Each structure stands twice: as C-alpha cells, then as structure tokens.
C-alpha cells in the first residue's frame, strides 16, 4: 500500500519560470495569467519585514521576466491578490487545462508537483497537517509549486508553496493567495502550532490494511465517540467528529468492522504499543491517507 | 524526505486500453505499436498451462480491441516478443515522447505509472528489488502499467506489469518481454527468493539524513568493506561491492563522512536496532531510495 500521487501531465504543461531582479521561482500559467508567489519581488534587504504594497508599485511589467520552456512571455500587466502575484501576459497557454480553485480543509490530501526554474521535477502525495503545515520536500528555488487533487476531467488546484518553517515543514497558501494557517511572508522564525494527528486519516489507513489482510491489531471491543476522543486526547490526535464516522462509512460496511469498533483497535495501539509490529509495512501509524485516497487505491478510480 | 516520482506526462499520453476477448488490460502506444502483457490472449480455460504460440495463431487482428480514449485503433498485425505482445496499429501516436526500452538492475528504483482501463489512476515510485519483484500497489486490470524513468528529455522505459505473487509482491518484465527473475507467465505460485536489503540504498538514505540534518546515528568507529559484508550478511542485507562505494563517494564528500565510516554506523544500527528512534521520520531502514535519488532529491535535478 503506497502513498500515490496524481497524474501530474495536466499540470506540467501549465509551469513557467518567473524572475524579478536575482530571485527566479515557479509561476501557473493558466489562461493569460501567471500565478506567483508575491515575495518575488523582495530584495535581501527588504526580507523582514517588506511593504509589498509599496513595494509592487516600485515595480514595471520588464522587471518580470517570463520564460515557458525557450518561450519569453511578455508581462502586460501586474497585480497583486493577497500573497500571489498575478502577471498579466500576452499570449495564452494553450495547455490550460479544465481548473478550479479550492481551499482545501486540514486532514486533506494532495499531490505536489515540485519545480524548479519552471520545470517539474517529481511528483509526491502530502497532506495539510491540521497546524496548517505541509511535509514536503522543496530546495531553493522550489516557490511556486503547486498542490493539486484531479476530479473527473478537473484540475483543482489547492496550494502554491512560499516557504519553510525552522521545524523543516512548510508553509504556502491557496491559488487566491491567502496562507494556510497563521504564517506571514516575511522573513522570521514562524511557530506552527502544535501538530496533531489526523484521526481520520489513521482510521481510514487501518482500514486498508484489513482490506490488504493485515489484520494482527483487531480485538473484540467497541467503544463510544465520547471515550475515544478522551483517549485520543492524550496522543495529540484530532478529535474524531460524527461527520468522520459517516466519511467511514463505507470503509467499515466493506470489511465488516464498525467504525467504533476500529476507534476501540486503534485506542489499544495508542495504549499499548505495536510491540514491534508492523501494518501495512509501517512501523507507525500512518495518517496521510484519507477515506478517499483508501478507496481510491483500493478500487482503482482513474 | 520523501518517496518522489518523476512527473508522468509523458507517459500518460502512451497509455491505451487493450481488450482481447473477456479480458481488458493497458498497452504502451509509442509510433505506431501497442506493447501489452501476452497473457491478454488467455481464457480461463487456459490458464494453468498455455501455449501462448499456438493460442496467438487461434486469434487474428479483430480480437484486439485497442482504444486510445475515444478514438478506436484498428490493429494492422500481432506478433509476439517474449512475454509481451506488439500490435501493429493503423495510427501512429502523435504524442510518442522520445524513448528507450532498459533492463534496470536489482536495487534500481523507478517510477510506475497506474492504470486502469487505459486511463492513468496514480503514480509512484518503487525499487526492483534484489530478488526480481517490486512492492507495488496493482489491482486487477493494472497489467499493461509501465514503469519508467526520465532521462534529460528521455524516457526509459524498463517494466511492464504482468502478475502478482502470493506474498503479494509483483512480478513483470523488460519492454521486450522479458520477466524479471525466475517468474513465467502461467497461474501458478510462484516463489521469488529471499528478498535482501539494498545496502548501497539504505547507505544513500542515511547519507540524506546527514545532509537533512538528522544524525544521531553516527558513531566514532570505521570499518574494512570485508567485516561489514560479514556482519550485512547475518542480517539478509546485499553485499556491498567497491562500485558500490564509488557510487557513494560524492554523498561522502558532500558530508565529509568516509563510505566506510556510514557502513561502521549502519553495522551499529543493525546490531542494536533504532531503541524507538526514527531517522528522517521512519522507524525502520529505508532501501528503496538509490545515491541518484538521494542526489536529485537533495539537489533539485529536473
Ligand atoms: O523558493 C524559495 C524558498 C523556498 C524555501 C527555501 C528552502 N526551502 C523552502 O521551502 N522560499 C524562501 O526562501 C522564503 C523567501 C521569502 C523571502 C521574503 C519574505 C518571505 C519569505 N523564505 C523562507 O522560506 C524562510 C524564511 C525564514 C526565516 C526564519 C526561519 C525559517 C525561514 N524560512
Ligand atoms: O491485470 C491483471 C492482473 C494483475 C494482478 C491481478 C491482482 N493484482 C495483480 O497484480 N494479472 C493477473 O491477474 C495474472 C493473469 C495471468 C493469467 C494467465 C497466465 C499468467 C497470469 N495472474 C496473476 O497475477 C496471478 C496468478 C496467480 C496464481 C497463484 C498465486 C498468485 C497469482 N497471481
């Protein structure tokens, strides 16, 4: 059972290569509009704490240089929404697939295309912890990738990455340039909160592994949604809410395991340990995995 | 630090449906061929024991129902290579990347391309594991899924997926048919070996833990390439050659940690386990990442 991401030959074609002054960094190009991360803009001695409305003015479309592929696009017209920058220009990509915008809840999941100099690198499957953070894997240069889930024919894009966080995680916002949790583009040392487990996201996992017929941390007992979320608690763990339960559903009516009696499973793990066991290959228990992508990976949707 | 697959828009556009009678499994459209598991000719009644020469002279063009999306490709001729079939198609595809058909080695990792019904579902990155499987993540009617890697502009192609074992690992072949390992195209089980443990992978891995800062795995000692191999022996880890530390040598200098220093270090783990520590968020030694993914990885390669 393997973290899996999307298919990302959608999004490829719509990566471009931004550069203002001596920061180069990823855009979107969608439509005739190019899609950035604002503090693109910033020189080193404006990193702490930068005046971008002032700053953008300071600013003409040829300090913007736009490159697709060996193609020079032509900034038009420059604006800014809340942390993106949005590059007007003259020609648009005839790659520009079916999208949408989404801001996506804590708990959910979706693929990264990482780049670098507008050309995708890799591919990989995170999840927007519940302090607001991801856990990803971008260098220098990597601003400006992008996060996104595919439904049906649509891409929906979720997450454009701005920075990292002195714990190594990282920290971006939605397509509308809003951040993700409490963090600010300057340059400081930003606490995430506390981060907890998605519970959820657990159960869900547990369920593949029964599915997968890895089965060994079933045990006989039920519990209720109060007494669980007072043991959950204690882990860090999210509470689980009866929006969960429902989400579940179906996972639990597939193996036949009611969704509190795996909340009394997964109880035991937290208590007791896995004394040196594994499920589903994994030594921890494993919370990147929604109820979606289970079924997902378990049925085989395309 | 995380599992990374190359980004897969290349390949999606050579993905087709292939359906032969009862059974419906993916090819790979380059020029104008379609690439499929031979085993899409069987019936029910001729799983055990086929003879795939005699039962590809019962078919003839018309049982091949090859559709790229929509559009129905109207198979010209058949012939077999090995354990793969090659139909000749009346279009060439126009989306045909520049390719090449490679035999990876054991401990070389690639990325694989999911598909279901000739429509790409995930993709992610897997190992060709020391005794010819790979854990992967396959339903029924994932044969026909390629795995690959992108060099420069190029894809290598080096999998076709064929079957799955009864430990629940998978087994397939080169682009020219040929199965990796003992494995053979009949319905039987199979046994692949012992499986061992990369150790020039797990090398590259503590090697990425260093470089990510996480380093309380290191130990004062060194140690000769001989008593390493005897004691990586005892635990089912492969034997580590000269290459092999060759390959590692700009990790090594990277970090100013001599090759055979790391080994003294992995050799300590292996003898006294993690004591509940994780290096680069795992519990267990992680094999399935080669010096060249640590590098790209680590330094951005696109
Ligand atoms: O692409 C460029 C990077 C991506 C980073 C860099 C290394 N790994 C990543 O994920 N973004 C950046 O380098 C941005 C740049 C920008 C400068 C102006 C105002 C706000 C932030 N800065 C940061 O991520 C960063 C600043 C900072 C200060 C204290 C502690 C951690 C920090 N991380
Ligand atoms: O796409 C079709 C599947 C992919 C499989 C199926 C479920 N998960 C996978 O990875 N291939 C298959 O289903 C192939 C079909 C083919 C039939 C004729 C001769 C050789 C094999 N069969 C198998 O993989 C298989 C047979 C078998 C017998 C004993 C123990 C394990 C086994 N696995």
Known sequence: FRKMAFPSGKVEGCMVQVTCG????????????????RHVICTSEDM???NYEDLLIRKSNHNFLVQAGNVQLRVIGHSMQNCVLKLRVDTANPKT???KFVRIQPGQTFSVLACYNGSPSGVYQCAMRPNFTIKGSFLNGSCGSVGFNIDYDCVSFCYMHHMNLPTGVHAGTDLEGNFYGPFVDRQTAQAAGTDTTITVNVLAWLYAAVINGDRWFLNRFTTTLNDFNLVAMKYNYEPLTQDHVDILGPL?????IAVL???ASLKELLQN???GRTILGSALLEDEFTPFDVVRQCSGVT
């Not at 639990?252 to 036949?256: K, M, R, V």
């Open 273 to 275: 340990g896995m004394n």
């Open 252 to 256: 639990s009516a597939q193996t036949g």
């Open 97 to 99: 697939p079916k999208y």
């Open 22 to 37: 001596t920061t180069t960094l990823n855009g979107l190009w969608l439509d005739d509009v190019v899609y950035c991360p």
């Open 261 to 263: 009696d795996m909340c």
């Open 48 to 50: 702490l704490n930068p």
